[PDB]
Short mmCIF file of all heavy atoms in Angstrom, two decimals:
data_model
loop_
_atom_site.label_atom_id
_atom_site.label_comp_id
_atom_site.label_asym_id
_atom_site.label_seq_id
_atom_site.Cartn_x
_atom_site.Cartn_y
_atom_site.Cartn_z
N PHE T 1 115.95 95.73 114.01
CA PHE T 1 115.02 95.55 112.93
C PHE T 1 115.53 94.53 111.93
O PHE T 1 116.73 94.52 111.62
CB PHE T 1 114.74 96.86 112.19
CG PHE T 1 113.91 97.82 113.01
CD1 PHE T 1 114.39 99.05 113.42
CD2 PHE T 1 112.62 97.47 113.40
CE1 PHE T 1 113.60 99.94 114.10
CE2 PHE T 1 111.87 98.35 114.16
CZ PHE T 1 112.34 99.55 114.50
N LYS T 2 114.64 93.69 111.44
CA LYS T 2 114.93 92.62 110.49
C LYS T 2 114.95 93.14 109.05
O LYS T 2 114.27 94.11 108.74
CB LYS T 2 113.94 91.47 110.59
CG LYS T 2 114.09 90.71 111.89
CD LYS T 2 113.20 89.48 112.02
CE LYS T 2 113.68 88.36 111.17
NZ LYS T 2 112.86 87.17 111.42
N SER T 3 115.78 92.52 108.21
CA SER T 3 115.80 92.81 106.79
C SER T 3 115.41 91.54 106.04
O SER T 3 115.65 90.44 106.52
CB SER T 3 117.15 93.33 106.34
OG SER T 3 118.18 92.48 106.79
N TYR T 4 114.78 91.71 104.89
CA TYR T 4 114.26 90.58 104.14
C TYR T 4 114.65 90.66 102.68
O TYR T 4 114.85 91.74 102.16
CB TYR T 4 112.72 90.56 104.15
CG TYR T 4 112.22 90.39 105.56
CD1 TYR T 4 111.84 91.49 106.31
CD2 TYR T 4 112.21 89.14 106.19
CE1 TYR T 4 111.41 91.34 107.63
CE2 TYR T 4 111.76 88.97 107.48
CZ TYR T 4 111.36 90.08 108.20
OH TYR T 4 110.98 89.92 109.50
N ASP T 5 114.71 89.52 101.99
CA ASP T 5 115.21 89.51 100.62
C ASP T 5 114.10 89.74 99.61
O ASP T 5 114.33 90.00 98.44
CB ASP T 5 115.88 88.17 100.30
CG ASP T 5 117.14 87.84 101.09
OD1 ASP T 5 117.80 88.79 101.56
OD2 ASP T 5 117.44 86.63 101.25
N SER T 6 112.84 89.69 100.04
CA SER T 6 111.72 89.82 99.13
C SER T 6 110.50 90.21 99.94
O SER T 6 110.46 89.94 101.13
CB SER T 6 111.42 88.50 98.38
OG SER T 6 110.93 87.48 99.26
N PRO T 7 109.47 90.79 99.32
CA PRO T 7 108.22 91.03 100.04
C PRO T 7 107.61 89.73 100.55
O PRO T 7 107.19 89.66 101.70
CB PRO T 7 107.31 91.81 99.07
CG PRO T 7 108.05 91.82 97.75
CD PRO T 7 109.45 91.32 97.97
N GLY T 8 107.66 88.67 99.73
CA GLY T 8 107.12 87.38 100.16
C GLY T 8 107.78 86.88 101.43
O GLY T 8 107.12 86.37 102.33
N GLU T 9 109.10 87.02 101.54
CA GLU T 9 109.80 86.55 102.72
C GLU T 9 109.50 87.40 103.96
O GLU T 9 109.69 86.94 105.07
CB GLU T 9 111.31 86.48 102.51
CG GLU T 9 111.65 85.31 101.58
CD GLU T 9 113.01 85.42 100.93
OE1 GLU T 9 113.16 86.22 99.96
OE2 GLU T 9 113.91 84.71 101.41
N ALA T 10 109.10 88.67 103.75
CA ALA T 10 108.80 89.57 104.87
C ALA T 10 107.38 89.34 105.40
O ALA T 10 107.11 89.72 106.53
CB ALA T 10 108.93 90.99 104.37
N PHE T 11 106.56 88.64 104.62
CA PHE T 11 105.13 88.55 104.85
C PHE T 11 104.83 87.92 106.20
O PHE T 11 104.07 88.50 106.98
CB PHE T 11 104.41 87.76 103.76
CG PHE T 11 102.91 87.64 104.04
CD1 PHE T 11 102.10 88.76 104.08
CD2 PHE T 11 102.35 86.40 104.34
CE1 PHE T 11 100.76 88.66 104.40
CE2 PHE T 11 101.02 86.31 104.65
CZ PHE T 11 100.22 87.43 104.66
N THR T 12 105.32 86.69 106.51
CA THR T 12 104.88 86.04 107.75
C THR T 12 105.13 86.90 109.00
O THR T 12 104.18 87.17 109.81
CB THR T 12 105.51 84.66 107.92
OG1 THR T 12 104.98 83.90 106.83
CG2 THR T 12 105.11 84.02 109.24
N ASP T 13 106.39 87.38 109.16
CA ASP T 13 106.75 88.18 110.34
C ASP T 13 106.00 89.51 110.35
O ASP T 13 105.67 90.04 111.43
CB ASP T 13 108.24 88.46 110.37
CG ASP T 13 109.18 87.27 110.52
OD1 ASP T 13 108.72 86.18 110.95
OD2 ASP T 13 110.38 87.46 110.26
N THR T 14 105.79 90.05 109.18
CA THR T 14 105.18 91.38 109.09
C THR T 14 103.70 91.23 109.48
O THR T 14 103.19 92.03 110.26
CB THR T 14 105.31 91.96 107.68
OG1 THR T 14 106.71 92.07 107.38
CG2 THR T 14 104.72 93.37 107.56
N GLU T 15 103.00 90.20 108.97
CA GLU T 15 101.60 90.01 109.32
C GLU T 15 101.41 89.80 110.84
O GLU T 15 100.45 90.31 111.42
CB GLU T 15 100.98 88.91 108.47
CG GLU T 15 99.49 88.77 108.79
CD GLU T 15 98.80 87.69 107.96
OE1 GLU T 15 99.26 86.52 108.14
OE2 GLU T 15 97.82 87.97 107.18
N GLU T 16 102.26 88.99 111.50
CA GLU T 16 102.19 88.79 112.92
C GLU T 16 102.28 90.12 113.68
O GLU T 16 101.49 90.38 114.61
CB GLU T 16 103.31 87.84 113.34
CG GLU T 16 103.44 87.69 114.85
CD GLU T 16 104.59 86.77 115.31
OE1 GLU T 16 105.68 86.79 114.67
OE2 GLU T 16 104.39 86.05 116.32
N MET T 17 103.16 91.02 113.21
CA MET T 17 103.29 92.31 113.84
C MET T 17 102.09 93.19 113.56
O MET T 17 101.62 93.93 114.44
CB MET T 17 104.52 93.04 113.30
CG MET T 17 104.77 94.30 114.04
SD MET T 17 106.34 94.97 113.48
CE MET T 17 106.19 96.53 114.33
N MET T 18 101.62 93.18 112.30
CA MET T 18 100.53 94.03 111.88
C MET T 18 99.32 93.76 112.78
O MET T 18 98.62 94.69 113.18
CB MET T 18 100.11 93.77 110.44
CG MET T 18 101.10 94.29 109.37
SD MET T 18 100.81 93.55 107.76
CE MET T 18 99.05 93.79 107.48
N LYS T 19 99.07 92.48 113.10
CA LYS T 19 97.84 92.15 113.82
C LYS T 19 97.86 92.67 115.25
O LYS T 19 96.79 92.79 115.86
CB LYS T 19 97.67 90.63 113.76
CG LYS T 19 97.15 90.16 112.42
CD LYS T 19 96.96 88.65 112.32
CE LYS T 19 96.16 88.02 113.38
NZ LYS T 19 96.26 86.59 113.10
N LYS T 20 99.04 93.03 115.77
CA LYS T 20 99.17 93.68 117.06
C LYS T 20 98.92 95.18 117.03
O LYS T 20 98.94 95.79 118.10
CB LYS T 20 100.57 93.36 117.62
CG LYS T 20 100.72 91.86 117.97
CD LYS T 20 102.13 91.46 118.36
CE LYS T 20 102.23 90.01 118.76
NZ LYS T 20 103.66 89.76 118.99
N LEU T 21 98.78 95.78 115.84
CA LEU T 21 98.26 97.12 115.60
C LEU T 21 99.20 98.26 116.00
O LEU T 21 98.75 99.43 115.97
CB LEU T 21 96.88 97.33 116.22
CG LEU T 21 95.80 96.31 115.85
CD1 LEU T 21 94.48 96.62 116.56
CD2 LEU T 21 95.55 96.30 114.36
N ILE T 22 100.44 98.00 116.38
CA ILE T 22 101.38 99.06 116.74
C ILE T 22 102.47 99.19 115.69
O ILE T 22 103.27 98.26 115.50
CB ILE T 22 102.03 98.76 118.09
CG1 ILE T 22 100.98 98.47 119.19
CG2 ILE T 22 102.97 99.91 118.49
CD1 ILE T 22 100.10 99.67 119.45
N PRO T 23 102.55 100.30 114.94
CA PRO T 23 103.59 100.43 113.91
C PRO T 23 104.96 100.64 114.55
O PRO T 23 105.06 101.26 115.64
CB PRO T 23 103.16 101.65 113.12
CG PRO T 23 102.32 102.44 114.11
CD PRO T 23 101.70 101.48 115.05
N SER T 24 106.03 100.23 113.82
CA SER T 24 107.39 100.57 114.21
C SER T 24 107.80 101.97 113.76
O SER T 24 108.65 102.61 114.41
CB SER T 24 108.37 99.57 113.60
OG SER T 24 108.24 99.49 112.20
N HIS T 25 107.20 102.44 112.65
CA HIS T 25 107.54 103.71 112.08
C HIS T 25 106.24 104.34 111.59
O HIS T 25 105.34 103.63 111.12
CB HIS T 25 108.46 103.52 110.86
CG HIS T 25 109.76 102.87 111.14
ND1 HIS T 25 109.94 101.56 111.48
CD2 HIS T 25 110.96 103.46 111.08
CE1 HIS T 25 111.24 101.35 111.62
NE2 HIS T 25 111.90 102.50 111.40
N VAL T 26 106.16 105.67 111.64
CA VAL T 26 105.06 106.43 111.01
C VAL T 26 105.76 107.59 110.31
O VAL T 26 106.41 108.42 110.96
CB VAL T 26 104.07 106.90 112.10
CG1 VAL T 26 102.95 107.69 111.43
CG2 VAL T 26 103.55 105.78 112.96
N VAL T 27 105.70 107.62 108.98
CA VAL T 27 106.52 108.51 108.20
C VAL T 27 105.68 109.26 107.18
O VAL T 27 104.59 108.82 106.80
CB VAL T 27 107.67 107.77 107.49
CG1 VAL T 27 108.59 107.15 108.54
CG2 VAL T 27 107.20 106.72 106.49
N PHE T 28 106.19 110.44 106.82
CA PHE T 28 105.67 111.20 105.71
C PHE T 28 106.56 111.05 104.49
O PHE T 28 107.78 111.07 104.60
CB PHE T 28 105.59 112.70 106.05
CG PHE T 28 104.72 113.12 107.20
CD1 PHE T 28 105.07 114.19 107.99
CD2 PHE T 28 103.61 112.41 107.59
CE1 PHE T 28 104.27 114.59 109.03
CE2 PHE T 28 102.82 112.79 108.64
CZ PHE T 28 103.13 113.91 109.34
N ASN T 29 105.96 110.86 103.31
CA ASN T 29 106.71 110.76 102.08
C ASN T 29 107.75 109.65 102.17
O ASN T 29 108.77 109.74 101.51
CB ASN T 29 107.37 112.09 101.66
CG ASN T 29 107.33 112.31 100.16
OD1 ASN T 29 106.26 112.30 99.55
ND2 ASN T 29 108.44 112.60 99.52
N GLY T 30 107.44 108.56 102.88
CA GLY T 30 108.19 107.32 102.75
C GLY T 30 109.37 107.10 103.66
O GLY T 30 109.92 106.00 103.66
N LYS T 31 109.81 108.09 104.42
CA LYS T 31 111.02 107.96 105.19
C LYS T 31 111.08 108.99 106.30
O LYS T 31 110.57 110.10 106.14
CB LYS T 31 112.21 108.19 104.25
CG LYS T 31 113.58 107.89 104.85
CD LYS T 31 114.63 108.15 103.76
CE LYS T 31 115.93 107.39 103.95
NZ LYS T 31 116.70 108.10 104.95
N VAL T 32 111.73 108.66 107.41
CA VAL T 32 112.00 109.65 108.44
C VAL T 32 112.77 110.80 107.82
O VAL T 32 113.76 110.60 107.09
CB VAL T 32 112.77 109.02 109.62
CG1 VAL T 32 113.10 110.10 110.65
CG2 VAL T 32 112.06 107.84 110.24
N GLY T 33 112.32 112.04 108.07
CA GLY T 33 113.06 113.20 107.62
C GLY T 33 112.90 113.51 106.14
O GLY T 33 113.57 114.40 105.60
N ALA T 34 111.99 112.83 105.46
CA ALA T 34 111.84 113.04 104.03
C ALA T 34 111.55 114.50 103.69
O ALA T 34 112.05 115.00 102.69
CB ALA T 34 110.80 112.12 103.44
N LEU T 35 110.66 115.13 104.44
CA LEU T 35 110.22 116.49 104.14
C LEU T 35 110.93 117.48 105.09
O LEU T 35 110.30 118.34 105.69
CB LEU T 35 108.70 116.53 104.27
CG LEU T 35 107.92 115.60 103.33
CD1 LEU T 35 106.41 115.82 103.50
CD2 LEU T 35 108.30 115.79 101.89
N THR T 36 112.27 117.41 105.15
CA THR T 36 113.14 118.24 105.99
C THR T 36 114.41 118.56 105.20
O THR T 36 114.62 117.97 104.15
CB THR T 36 113.49 117.60 107.33
OG1 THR T 36 114.43 116.54 107.15
CG2 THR T 36 112.29 117.14 108.15
N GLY T 37 115.16 119.57 105.71
CA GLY T 37 116.42 120.05 105.16
C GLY T 37 116.20 120.63 103.77
O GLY T 37 115.29 121.43 103.53
N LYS T 38 116.99 120.17 102.81
CA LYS T 38 116.81 120.52 101.40
C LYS T 38 115.39 120.21 100.91
O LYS T 38 114.94 120.78 99.91
CB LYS T 38 117.78 119.73 100.52
CG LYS T 38 117.39 119.91 99.05
CD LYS T 38 118.06 118.98 98.06
CE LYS T 38 117.19 118.74 96.88
NZ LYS T 38 117.98 118.13 95.81
N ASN T 39 114.70 119.24 101.55
CA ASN T 39 113.38 118.86 101.06
C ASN T 39 112.29 119.36 102.01
O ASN T 39 111.17 118.91 101.89
CB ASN T 39 113.25 117.35 100.81
CG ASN T 39 114.32 116.84 99.88
OD1 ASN T 39 114.31 117.13 98.67
ND2 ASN T 39 115.29 116.17 100.47
N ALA T 40 112.59 120.36 102.84
CA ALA T 40 111.50 121.06 103.52
C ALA T 40 110.50 121.62 102.53
O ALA T 40 110.80 122.06 101.42
CB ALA T 40 111.99 122.15 104.45
N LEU T 41 109.24 121.67 102.96
CA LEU T 41 108.22 122.42 102.30
C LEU T 41 108.51 123.91 102.45
O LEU T 41 109.18 124.31 103.40
CB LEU T 41 106.86 122.02 102.87
CG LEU T 41 106.55 120.52 102.95
CD1 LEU T 41 105.18 120.36 103.53
CD2 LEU T 41 106.68 119.89 101.58
N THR T 42 108.05 124.73 101.51
CA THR T 42 108.39 126.15 101.53
C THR T 42 107.15 126.99 101.31
O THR T 42 106.16 126.54 100.72
CB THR T 42 109.43 126.54 100.49
OG1 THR T 42 108.81 126.35 99.23
CG2 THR T 42 110.72 125.76 100.65
N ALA T 43 107.22 128.21 101.87
CA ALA T 43 106.21 129.21 101.62
C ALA T 43 106.81 130.57 101.94
O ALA T 43 107.90 130.69 102.46
CB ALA T 43 104.94 128.96 102.46
N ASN T 44 106.01 131.58 101.60
CA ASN T 44 106.33 132.96 101.95
C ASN T 44 105.17 133.50 102.75
O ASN T 44 104.04 133.13 102.56
CB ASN T 44 106.51 133.86 100.75
CG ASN T 44 107.69 133.47 99.88
OD1 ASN T 44 108.80 133.27 100.36
ND2 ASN T 44 107.47 133.23 98.61
N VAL T 45 105.44 134.43 103.69
CA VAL T 45 104.41 135.21 104.33
C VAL T 45 103.49 135.79 103.28
O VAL T 45 103.95 136.38 102.27
CB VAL T 45 105.04 136.32 105.20
CG1 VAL T 45 103.98 137.27 105.73
CG2 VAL T 45 105.86 135.74 106.34
N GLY T 46 102.18 135.60 103.50
CA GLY T 46 101.13 136.03 102.60
C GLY T 46 100.60 134.96 101.64
O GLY T 46 99.58 135.17 100.99
#
């Protein structure tokens, strides 16, 4: 995966990929594993 110094610099390569319609990542809350471990969602029975 490529890294970029600015959103503007990421634009050309990112648009070329976007138009192919296949994401590299699909995430919840911004990152892989964001809503896991200490940041799991919680509930109780009932």
Side-chain angles (χ1 to χ4, degrees):
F1 289 117
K2 291 184 74 175
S3 50
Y4 297 96
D5 295 335
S6 68
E9 288 160 284
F11 178 63
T12 295
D13 296 342
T14 299
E15 183 180 61
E16 173 182 38
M17 186 173 172
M18 287 163 51
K19 282 180 52 185
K20 293 173 177 175
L21 306 178
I22 307 297
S24 56
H25 299 70
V26 180
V27 297
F28 299 146
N29 218 56
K31 188 179 204 281
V32 177
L35 299 184
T36 73
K38 169 192 151 166
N39 305 289
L41 310 180
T42 66
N44 295 311
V45 172

